[PDB]
Amino acid sequence: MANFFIDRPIFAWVLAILLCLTGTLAIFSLPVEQYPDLAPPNVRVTANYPGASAQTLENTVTQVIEQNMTGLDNLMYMSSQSSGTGQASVTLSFKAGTDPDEAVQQVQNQLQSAMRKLPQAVQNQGVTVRKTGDTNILTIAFVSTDGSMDKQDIADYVASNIQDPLSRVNGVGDIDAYGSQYSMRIWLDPAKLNSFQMTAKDVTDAIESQNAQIAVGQLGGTPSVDKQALNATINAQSLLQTPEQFRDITLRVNQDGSEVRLGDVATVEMGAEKYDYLSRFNGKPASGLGVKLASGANEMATAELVLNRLDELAQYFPHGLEYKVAYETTSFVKASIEDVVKTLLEAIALVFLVMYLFLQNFRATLIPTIAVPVVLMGTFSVLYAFGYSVNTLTMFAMVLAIGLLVDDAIVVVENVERIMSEEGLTPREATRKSMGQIQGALVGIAMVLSAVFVPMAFFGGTTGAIYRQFSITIVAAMVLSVLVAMILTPALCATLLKPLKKGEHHGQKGFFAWFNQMFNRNAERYEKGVAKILHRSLRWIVIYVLLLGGMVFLFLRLPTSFLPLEDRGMFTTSVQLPSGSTQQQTLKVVEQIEKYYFTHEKDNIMSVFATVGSGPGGNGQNVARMFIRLKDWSERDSKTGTSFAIIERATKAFNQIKEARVIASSPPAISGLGSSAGFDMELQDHAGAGHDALMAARNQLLALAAENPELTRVRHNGLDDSPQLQIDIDQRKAQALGVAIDDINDTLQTAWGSSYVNDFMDRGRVKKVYVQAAAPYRMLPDDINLWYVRNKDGGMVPFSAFATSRWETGSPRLERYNGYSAVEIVGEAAPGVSTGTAMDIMESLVKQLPNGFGLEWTAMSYQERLSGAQAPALYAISLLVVFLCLAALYESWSVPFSVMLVVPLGVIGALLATWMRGLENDVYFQVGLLTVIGLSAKNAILIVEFANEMNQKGHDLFEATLHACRQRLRPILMTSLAFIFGVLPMATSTGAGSGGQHAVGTGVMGGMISATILAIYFVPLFFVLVRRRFPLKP
Amino acid sequence: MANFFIDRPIFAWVLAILLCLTGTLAIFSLPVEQYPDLAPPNVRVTANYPGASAQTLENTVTQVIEQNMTGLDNLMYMSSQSSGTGQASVTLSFKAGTDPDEAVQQVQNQLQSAMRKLPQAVQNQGVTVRKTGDTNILTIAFVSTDGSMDKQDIADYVASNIQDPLSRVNGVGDIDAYGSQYSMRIWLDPAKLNSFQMTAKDVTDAIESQNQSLLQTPEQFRDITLRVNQDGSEVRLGDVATVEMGAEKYDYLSRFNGKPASGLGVKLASGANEMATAELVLNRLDELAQYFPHGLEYKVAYETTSFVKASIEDVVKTLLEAIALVFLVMYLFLQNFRATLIPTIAVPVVLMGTFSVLYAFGYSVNTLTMFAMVLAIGLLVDDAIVVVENVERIMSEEGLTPREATRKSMGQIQGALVGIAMVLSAVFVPMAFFGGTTGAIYRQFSITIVAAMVLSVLVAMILTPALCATLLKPLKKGEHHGQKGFFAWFNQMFNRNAERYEKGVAKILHRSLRWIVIYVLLLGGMVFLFLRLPTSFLPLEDRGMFTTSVQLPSGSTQQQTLKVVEQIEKYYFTHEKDNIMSVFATVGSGPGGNGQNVARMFIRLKDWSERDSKTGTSFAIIERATKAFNQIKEARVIASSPPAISGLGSSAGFDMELQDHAGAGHDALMAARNQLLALAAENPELTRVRHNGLDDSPQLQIDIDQRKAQALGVAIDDINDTLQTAWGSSYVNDFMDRGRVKKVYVQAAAPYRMLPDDINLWYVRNKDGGMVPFSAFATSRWETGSPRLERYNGYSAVEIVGEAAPGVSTGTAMDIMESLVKQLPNGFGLEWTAMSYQERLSGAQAPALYAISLLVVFLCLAALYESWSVPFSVMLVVPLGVIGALLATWMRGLENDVYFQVGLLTVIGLSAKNAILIVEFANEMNQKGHDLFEATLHACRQRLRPILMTSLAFIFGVLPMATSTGAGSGGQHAVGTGVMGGMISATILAIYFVPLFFVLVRRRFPLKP
């Protein structure tokens, strides 16, 4: 095979160009994203029980749904919430890798059975099963520059002209609006309704009848008269437009001729929602839009399309109105991708430099350099074939691959160079002899570097997904490298390499002469040291045992984590005032926070966008969210301008604040995994005690977490108990009075909340018509008698007759996790503390809690625990696979055992590097450790294969291994330094996702350094000891 | 390999027989169709909101569905229509190659979320998601010869006895009816109603309560007792109404050759074969015809199988003529009959192997595959011709035996055959990877030609050496030439011309500089011709049918449209009597929409044999009609040919969507539409530019004030019910007719629902039971509304369709339309759809295809011959063929369409073939050590005859295509002309330039040793 392409260089060039072209086509047709999926598919079930208390809703609907949904295939955990507004939601998070459509189908199938057990009112209302989505791509703030357009006017214009077209952009699953358009709201006064003996149902029916558009046929229908002139459609009536027309709805005509107009019994206004969001941008009134990513779509492409359309719409904006990007994800993605590309290019440059250092000839340096683009573009082609994308994980895998893929080419080139220098052969003959000598070595190196990354793909969960990204990439790179090393590189060595060795051009005075002298002296000293340690076995055996002990000690000592957080240039601060606080108090707190960010962080904040209030449908106005976008990483300082610092300073300043709970939290590492960064914990109530006991336990846990300095920003992801109305309707009592359940339910909705009747045309735009009770009347336990629902006989039966209301204090939102009443508690570790340590502290604290309360990590915390548990298996399986492959290749059990003894030498170095740098045992460290295992195996192989060949030929074991070390010292050193300087840009990257680059690079670089400086001595020791223990048959 | 089959010919014969048998098996089991599945799949979501205006329907239903359907995988574009009748449809077109079933399933899944958001009435009606067939395979008109049955009689029979059986026929997706079954129509009389003091609601309530035990005859309905007086006298329905057995829907009025008739529109189920389904349907109809009442007979008004069958037969004829011409030219160069037969035997073997490959891949016998076969016929014989020519030359010069000559020849030309197969197959490989309809077309040709090339090389290395060693007579010149007639003169002329050619090649080699400037001029001319050449997607074909559509001003009645229809029928019967077989008009149906002001007319021309070749062409008669129809100012009448691809578009020409990007409103959009139409009418490069929709129609809006309505104690529901019953139609109950359950409708009589003031003739029953006139609480008012509202990709849009003027390509027309849209007021933009979108896609993707194909050929040659010099010498001759292809296309008048693109690829392959046939021998001789000039001159001298015969075989193979006159003449011309010109130029220029390129490259890069 090697000789075939040695004699046919053009064929090898053609194959290389084919690979390059396929890669170039793939690169321009590959989607770009930060992380590929990595999020378990969640399916949400939503049910509504109007006028139902939280406890009643949970008991009647939520628990039934939970019971029926148990037994789903690949289900991971269930999270459910029961709200006081009458809406119940049960989120079903499935195992990662599961197709969302199948999960939705199964959920719907079980909901078919579950529905009949639900209350009939809920069944009539409807139950929805949809994939969650819930990934806010960007938040857009619309602010009036001139100030001419009022905040309500801005909200109306946005919801009328901007929300509709943006909702139809590809990949836009949902677009939340932080402002409500104008609507024909009618405020019923029950005093007037009772005065004229008209119920709310009469008003609703009259509005339906008198505001409608019905087509009644055609003027000049098809069976027409002999000679007609027109064929026109006929409409019964038209939709009301002005509020005055609504005030003229008749509702009755008395025998005297008096009419009870709608304006006489109620008040109509073309206003907005009662409790619409009080959104602000940079201290100015504004509206907002929250664009969410549709499940299974590219965030970058969707954001580009959305922004583009917004630009188009902007062209036709009213004067003074302009949009602002208050929140954006694509920035970081682009910055991180470009930074990793720069790191890859610098890695290629450093590999070229080190190869040129070892190989003075420029062509001899080019020959392995040409392998880099070919293998890289082939890897891109393979990624395109398997449907992968250009993400951070794949680019990290590519940068890690660079050194491994150039290893075989370097080995071939330097073997050819050594043969040319020593035996004085022609480049073609030297290349042929080199291929004959080291055909086995290339295969062994590729096997060891690819066998490590095979078992990873099989693992499941998000961790498995991350591993797979690296596996596919690295395995494809290794396969192409071993293919390139036996196809392209031999031809390049045969042709490009001039016979300058015969020309005796070597010997030029300069830096390279000094380098060669130093290398020769060090090689002689190294061989002497190898001989000495082979004579003095026991001392270095003891040293190896000590190294094993140190490796175990560092493995136990190293803190653990899942993924390093990155400065995305953005963070969110959440404000939660004491329950019952008005919107104005929350606004004042928000203003204080805005002032703090404007004066203290003036050099870093680009824009702050606040969203006061939970919204028109929200129960409380004491909750606000503040989207903060920092300036470009470049502009912000690298020491104090970092989000992590800014967040720490803000956290101290906000803990100083006692008016309300204010927490500044960075966005989560993975978009779909969780809500915010840090650990996520559910405080389950296993004993089944009361909700008050759970609340007391939650308060105690929060106090204990505040006590611990290792924990910071610990908060409850929920709402505190507040007084809430419980309008209870006695169906038997009502039907005894002969009053329809539907009518009383509609009246309850109209009074307690809002009722949608129909649409009306405003300026050519259809807008909804809402009928609501007057401001003082909200179906209080006091005014429930004021409302009447006339029975079938027509008698106005008072609502108080068949129903009762009471102000009962309780939790507005009841949460239930995996069939236990639980409160979700989230928080972050203190600076210098890993997430795993924080989780251990939280477990200790929950142990300190009264018995019956347990914890169960969810989302990112759950998958971090999964990865931590599965890591030892991953290593064991990878080591076993490597050992088996080595045994198969060399048809022996002594050689692989000799090789596998070198793995601790690299593992100790990786552990030391990560420990000294201050990093932690996260997913990246785990993938690194596997790379270090493969690299140590490669370094051991380079010596043991040659020594074993010499032994099988019959050479003396001691002399054979000494000769092997003498010959292969240069290959090990240069294939090692190529990788060490390949990952050097990663370990020293600045900006973008520098955190992930550091986490990946540092461990592998340290592991490589230790692997070389220890293997070049210990590998002879292990091989000699094993062969003496188990000599060959001859 | 070759020597093995030379020693064992029986095994080669067995392999050839196996290939032939497999091909014959495949031919009989391959579907026959015009085109493969080229049209992108479409999924239509229909929702029917009864009693809703178009604007309300769009606001409440169409927009919700559009919002929810966003996010579908492989979605090209989304189009929706909101009709004033109350039916909304959203058409989702996915990328070509997407599985229709997967698309439908995904649409249904994503619709489930949208179901609750829709208005309750819409949900109760039920939204339907189904594949969009929308391909009228067969339009049957039923007419009564004796005149015994009226239009309704015919319609009922059709609906009762014919529509149902044909629906169950396999492959029939939908069967549209241009008529409706009977329905016991009850025409109310307001004067009679007032005389007896009864409202329309009383009649409706009585009838709905009258009811198996259902009334049968109208006389039973006339005796229905509405009420009984105290005196014992009763008021019957006949006293107050006129009951007759009419139609449930009076929408359509169909005429066949001026005679009343009813029609059926048969639509193809997705995936079904068109020809087989049409054959099944017609057969079934004939069976049903066995029981037709006297006089009633069905007549086909629109059929596609005729043109498909005729085109396939024509392509088979041109294929056979190509084989004959290839045999003739080979016999011209190879005077021996057996030497001519040996490559001829390869043609059936390779063809049947290609058919077997097509069957294995699941392809079918369509026009594209057949064109590819015809091209391959010239292509495939190349290797066999080379082998036979080399054997003949060895036998003539060395005098060896046929076995020894074949054995020497195979070793001599082993490389040449592989190179020829590589170059003729590497061009068509990348083309297959392109997507869309264009990609599909490309793939058809690729799969066919690549399989043919592989099989041709296999036959050349297996079967042909055995034939040469056995069939060829050792006495090649036992009686010398043996012909002193035409063959002797031809041989003398060829020898003299070959000597002149060699001398000229030597002269051109000596004078290198002069001809390099000529090559640069040829490059410049090639670029200029490529830029100047107009572009298109596919050639239109005379399919024997065309459709004219009538659209009167909005508000026109059915009779007014019928008058224009009769005028058009008179025009067709007078001016186009000798070319038109039949015309089938359907008042009330139109491509833009349905209404009394729109009519669609189907015209079937006579067979191509009867119609004149110059003045009887579909294009010519259509142009004459458009010249005549533009004089008609009563209505907008446009005669259009069927689209090139059935599922791609509604009609031929371009198809754009003028959409409102600024949301200026519907009125601004209509004003822009009118301005654009005026501009298009002004331009002479455009013709038949029309709006594929309905203009705003007058609407009579009733205004009821509720104060006086409630003052008189009148319910709004009652006044709406009376209005619907009188002006519209009320479905009271059912009645059984001849064992069939049919509807009963109540409506006001014609004279009493014909003017706006007729509202005052009706009365409503108040709470007290009194009669209140409508004039008391109702006033009418005229307004204006849009019967049908269209949206495209979210934006409100109006679909503008049209055709380029004769002599103008579709690409030029699209550019003109883009300029006109630019002339429109700001805020309006355009987006090409249907075939026009695919045309733009192909035009964008063509340069990539060319570059990638050229690169692939270069790399394959470099790998094969292990030298960069050889492909660079070869690839320099590609422009020499491209210039000829462009020149032939420009001279004939064709354009740069898909066929031209596939041709250019074939021309590249052929130029590479000739360049290989020279440079392979030249390079081998130079490698041996021979002088470069001597080597190249010897290569030219030896390979002139193989090149000339392998090229004449191809040119005369494609000559029948370029001169065809059958059904699919346009496509055959488009395919054949460019390739024929490219081959001609490639030969007559390469045979001189290839030596120059090779010598120049070798002198610049001399072989080291």
Residue numbers in the entry:
A (entry chain B): 1 to 1034
B (entry chain A): 1 to 211, 237 to 1034
From the reporting publication:
The Escherichia coli acriflavine resistance protein D (AcrD) is an efflux pump that belongs to the resistance-nodulation-cell division (RND) superfamily. It works in conjunction with the AcrA periplasmic membrane fusion protein and the TolC outer membrane channel to eliminate aminoglycosides and minimize the toxicity of these drugs.
It is interesting to note that this dimeric oligomerization has not been previously identified among the HAE- and HME-RND families of transporters.
